[PDB]
Amino acid sequence: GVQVETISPGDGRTFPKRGQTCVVHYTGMLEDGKKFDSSRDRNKPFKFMLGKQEVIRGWEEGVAQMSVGQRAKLTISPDYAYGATGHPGIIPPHATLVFDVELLKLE
Amino acid sequence: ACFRMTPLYNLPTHRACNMFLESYKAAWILTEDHSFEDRMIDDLSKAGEQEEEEEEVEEKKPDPLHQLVLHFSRTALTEKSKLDEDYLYMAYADIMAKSCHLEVEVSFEEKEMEKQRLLYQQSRLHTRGAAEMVLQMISACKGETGAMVSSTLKLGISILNGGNAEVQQKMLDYLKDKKEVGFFQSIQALMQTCSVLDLNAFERQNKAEGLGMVNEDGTVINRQNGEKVMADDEFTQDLFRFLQLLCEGHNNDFQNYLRTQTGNTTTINIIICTVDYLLRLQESISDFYWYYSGKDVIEEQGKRNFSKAMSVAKQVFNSLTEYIQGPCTGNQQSLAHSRLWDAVVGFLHVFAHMMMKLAQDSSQIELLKELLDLQ
Amino acid sequence: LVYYEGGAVCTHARSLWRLEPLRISWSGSHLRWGQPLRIRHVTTGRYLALTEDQGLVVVDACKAHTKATSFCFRVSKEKLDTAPKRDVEGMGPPEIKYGESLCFVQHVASGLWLTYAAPDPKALRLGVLKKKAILHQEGHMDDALFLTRCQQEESQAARMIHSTAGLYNQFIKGLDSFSGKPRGSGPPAGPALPIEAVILSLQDLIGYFEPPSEELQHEEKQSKLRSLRNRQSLFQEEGMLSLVLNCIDRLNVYTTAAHFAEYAGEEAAESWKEIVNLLYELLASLIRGNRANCALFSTNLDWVVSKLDRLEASSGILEVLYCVLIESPEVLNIIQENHIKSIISLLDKHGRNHKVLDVLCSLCVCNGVAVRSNQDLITENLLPGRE
Amino acid sequence: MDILELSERLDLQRFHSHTLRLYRAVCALGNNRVAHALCSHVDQAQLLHALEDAHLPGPLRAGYYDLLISIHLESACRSRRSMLSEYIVPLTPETRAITLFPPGRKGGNARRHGLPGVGVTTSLRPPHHFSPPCFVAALPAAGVAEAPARLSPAIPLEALRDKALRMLGEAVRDGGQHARDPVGGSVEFQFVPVLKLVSTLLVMGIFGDEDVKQILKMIEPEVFTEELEEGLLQMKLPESVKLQMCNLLEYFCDQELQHRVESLAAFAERYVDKLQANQRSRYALLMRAFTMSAAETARRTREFRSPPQEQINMLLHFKDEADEEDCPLPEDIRQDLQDFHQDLLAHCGIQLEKKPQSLQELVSHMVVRWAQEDYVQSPELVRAMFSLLHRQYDGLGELLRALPRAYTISPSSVEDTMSLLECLGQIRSLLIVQMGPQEENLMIQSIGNIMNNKVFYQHPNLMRALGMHETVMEVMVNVLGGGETKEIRFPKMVTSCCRFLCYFCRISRQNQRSMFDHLSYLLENSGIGLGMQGSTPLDVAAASVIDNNELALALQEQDLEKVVSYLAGCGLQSCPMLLAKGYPDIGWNPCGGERYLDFLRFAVFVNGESVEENANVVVRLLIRKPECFGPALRGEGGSGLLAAIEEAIRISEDPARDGPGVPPEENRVHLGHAIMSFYAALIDLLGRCAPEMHLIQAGKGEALRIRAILRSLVPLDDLVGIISLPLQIPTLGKDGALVQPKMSASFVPDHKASMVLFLDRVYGIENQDFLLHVLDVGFLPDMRAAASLDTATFSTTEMALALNRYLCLAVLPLITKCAP
């Protein structure tokens, strides 16, 4: 349930594989247009490693399809995010999440 | 265990340091004398260079000492179920109390100088609402014993020493205009909670001291934890000392007010309440005599408990004497129709038999001297 | 029935009695030993009496015929029987003192003495410290009674409770007259409701329970607060708080004044909105700042919450809820999700009112202790919507 | 719309200001999970922007400053502030270098005071823990109340502290300019929000030495110089700002107090080494004293035959100059302590000019000047300034009251102590929150971690100083306080706290005495503790007096009267919990009564002897309320002790009268067994109240009277009848399965053991004929039954083990006494 729509092209050659740390800058909004999270506000890039289930499964496939330097828009269905339980106080249940993710680098 | 006691140099450093801190504070910090109450009260009693205008500002906003008393008077008048413990009030009540007394042929001239110097130190407080604060704090405790009421009573005694008529007038005026019953209800409740000689408590202590307990970390030599026989004897003495000072100098108005409060909706006879405690104290002393009546010699612990009981009995007798002197005819009639005669009869029985018993050994001559002046 | 009871009853209004001598002129003169007099219960208006059926009871004024209700105070139980003393035209000599004189209450007609019933054993386990008061020919040695003065504030409040209870009970039974009887195109077919009396009584009580102004000095403000708390407790212990709730409930079964007009007529319906607002205003005053009164809603909280959507008294009911939550920690422990959703729904339906936010703030922390369940429910049901 | 438009739109300004208040309410008092949620609504960038926005309305500016503290700093500051009252100083090389005054050449008695809050502090403080606010991480698979507790959201502290310093510095200059448009609309709205942020960061310890120096310059640039720029103290601020200034000065006064404690601890480490080295050398030469001395060597070795606390008391007894003979220290060692004592008094400003030249003189002058310049109207400010003033005048007394919370530890135990402090901080955080399923798990694991820590057992005094037992007790009573009669919830938390306190008492007598001070507090909460099973507050009260004669003799009569009143109630009403479970309604509560009986058993019987002071009181209290003896022994209309036990056996054998008749409930209560257990406990209590033999032989009147009363209550024939009652024996049959009795629902040898104790202590066996009569009906059948059970199958059965305990503790010791 992840759809990846490109915003700005990357290198198109290097892609993140399993066990590699991904450094991304993201801004997450509900699909109706309400923002709820953004790494830009904290002014600190978000780091995570693929395959360790550190993030929601929607980010697992979405970032894997992106290249280094690419900025893309990921639309994640409720099943590939928090879903029925949701995130209490942040994300309502059965909410589709839209993310503007830029893959800064891999480490 | 004495021959296998561990020497200090075999202890770990951290354990020895902890023992050093306890020893150092008891022998060097506690023993240190630092008198700052007089200096602190003097500093707070000064108005700070505001006399360059001398306009109709003659309202004369309170000085720092006056504002301190008003603050404590504010929390005493607050409508609360219980007067919560306040270390700040206790600390300042002791400071104010310690700044008022500051005390072999004293001449007439300096005898009056000491009285006037005493009056001036008391004047620094009762002219800033301290007299009213003492009454409010006593009414606020609602008859619950503790450090708060004990500190208040000591402060009240400090400003009433020598029979300060000006403080007595301020206290009497405040009680009569407010017409509150809480003050005497609190006083009556406190007097009913005053302890007397308890033989059951005394018997328990004798067995406890015979065990010879020790602690784990080291060894304590017969730890001297709080006495459980007339533990609040000092509180009882100051409670009746405070009542005596209200009538000191033959203050007939205050003597009548203790017997009856005309303006209040309910009346509590403090004069009768004093006799009630005297009967309980007398009965305890009589029971104590019977305990040692069979025994040939009164041991050290018994003599010490006798001494503190006699000291309390002296204060109660002095308080009763101050009630009726002047003379106060109303208080004399109240005592005549009270159970005071029963207490006096009981004391005479104890006095007669103790005098005969104590005179049979010179080791108890000091106790006999205390008994004689009690009579 | 009359009992000898101790504890908190010694400061309540149901232990207050009025001594009424058998005359009008100089009825306020000094009481004398052996002087006949009636004893009246202030809050209920009934008179101590001796009946051939139940013995010692309190009867209504229509049954106090100077024979069952005549009592006298005697200094001793000795049968003096000297002579009937003749009353004087003046205050007379003072004989009986407050709190010093020991008085034996004797029924004049029968000569019986007021005493206790010597409660049967096996009843002490029930916690019944009450001893039933009876009239007996012999009595006991400790039958003497102390007469203690009552403050003017308590005496006035007890009489007000007597008058307030009678008026609202009349108002309540008037509402029940047409509870399910539509008037149709005619009169309500019953006695007129005391609309003007109820409105004036409510306004007087609201001003009677008004909190002291914050501009007063600390000393007199605390004195007024102490008196206010005492008067709130006195009314609550006599069922005035429950009496107000009954008036609200019977008036709350009508959705609007026009609906109320279908049963009480137009002349009574034009004051329907005014009365309900005053009832909630009085209810808030009876509990504002009184934790004991606010704790009573820990059993009936849906009563307040379910009325939040009422349009006639939206502001008054919200004030009642606010007073309860800021005083009683017990109510915060019974708050459920449906209660919070109802309060949040008040923002959605009544607009952005900052008082509703204050109500939600009071649900989280009370007296320095936080409730995690309330904090999570408010966060879950209010924040993620972002509406 | 621009948020700055709210300066004229007052309707939205009030609503939004109260919205920020609601944000603080939902995350208040350690609700870190909600605090993370709030970061999605008010992000870090918005908060930082709001701090520097000079056009924000006052209510909004104050609200956003408080919102930032609540979300990010409130939890850390509160936890840190609780630890600031204790001084756990490890004996590390950093601690050794700590001195009262900086190295200088001003004066030998005292150099100039250093800057408060500047220097090296070695007191243990657990570090702050924060988590990054992230809303894309996978939701934990861990269920609610089982996942680890959430930490506070993380915000860059180094950047935040620089902004707070810069904003405060700008405000001081701006306040000097007397601008007609202060930030926030007033001077109060310009300084109070900034000062709250600076005060919060100071308590958390975020500022370094250089940062603290800058703060001191802003407070008072003339006093706080080490070797229009007007300070805050002279800017004539309103009372609200003055309250925040007192908080700042309170922190620096605390740092001076902490410095004195650490310096005193530092000197102790150095001085103890000299004391230990000198005492070792003195003992070495003292072993050769016989060649030049005589019997008075005992006087010289008196030190080494004394407890170490007494040894160090004698060594330090050289202050008054009248005790220079008993102290064996050389004069050079004595001088070092006197040198430190002089500079300690000087550092407290005891003894040894418009410029204060020190924090103590600055604060005292400032408070007096404030009070004499205007009539202060804020009661909070008045208390704050006079509390601060009292500390300056009494510095030695302030140090004296802080020493009991000071404790030195080995550097090798720092990591375990830090772990213990972390667990204690979690427990202390539960004093401000209603107990719930999540908090219950945190409380249980925190107690388990503490009881798994070696420091908890090695340093009982440190645990007592930290008030660990008080904190656990307060948490327990809050749960017991709510629902005190209808139902007790979170039972696992209650039994965890009670078990913790029971082990706390058994560590040392001082811990046991500390819990004894709350004996009345525990008893008043023990009325409903019968409902919970396992470890109860009544068990904690019993554990605080067990095997301690000093505490047993100190037991007040009111506490015993309270227990007997509870016991009387159990003898007159059925258990409400049992009735709600379908149990038959017998007119008393044997289960509840037994629990109170065993508490009195520990109060009257200590170390194998009866405490006559407690025994006499309990017996007199029991007879004044005869319903404490149960429906039997009632006097009129009451069956005897033997009849009651026989009736209980018939109840046990018959269902629909022993239980609900719907273990089945895993703790199923059997009324037949419960009735026997009550009387067995009652007979055991009365037996232990019997006077000792030496008192009876001495002919004491009180002892004889008590024994006569006990004999009247329990006849001798009933004791023999109960002992003679048959016991069900595990047999074999029906293919060879063992037919065993259920020990929780039948007559057990433990019931007989109580009867034997009463018979021995109260009646005794004095004649041969009675001894033979007891053997062949009561003892020998039980001895044969145990012997027959010593086979391959029946040896390990529960009944056989119970018989062995009964014989080896009650019967056989009695027969050994009666051997002649």
Numbering used by the authors:
A (entry chain F): 1 to 107
B (entry chain A): 3634 to 3736, 3749 to 4020
C (entry chain A): 244 to 630
D (entry chain A): 1648 to 1874, 1922 to 2046, 2088 to 2397, 2410 to 2567
Quote the passages of the study that discuss this structure, keeping the authors' original sentences.
Caffeine, a xanthine derivative found in plants, has been used for decades as a pharmacologic research tool for activating RyRs, and its functional and binding properties have been extensively described. Here, using cryo-EM, we explore multiple xanthine derivatives and related compounds and identify 4-oxopyrimidine/2-pyridone as the minimal motif necessary for binding to the xanthine/caffeine binding site in RyRs.
Caffeine interacts with RyR1–Trp4716 by pi–pi stacking in a hydrophobic pocket formed also by residues RyR1–Phe3753 and RyR1–Ile4996, as described by cryo-EM. We observed that caffeine is as expected pi stacked between RyR1–Trp4716 and RyR1–Ile4996 and interacts with the backbone carbonyl of RyR1–Glu4239 through a bridge water molecule (through carbonyl C6=O) but does not engage RyR1–Tyr5014 (the N1 is methylated). The small size of xanthine and caffeine molecules in addition to the hydration shell is probably what in the past had hindered the determination of the coordination of caffeine, and now with better processing power and resolution, we can be certain of the binding mode of both xanthine and caffeine. Moreover, engagement of RyR2–Glu4194 and RyR1–Glu4239 suggests that stabilization of the thumb and forefinger domain (TaF) adds another layer of signal transduction.
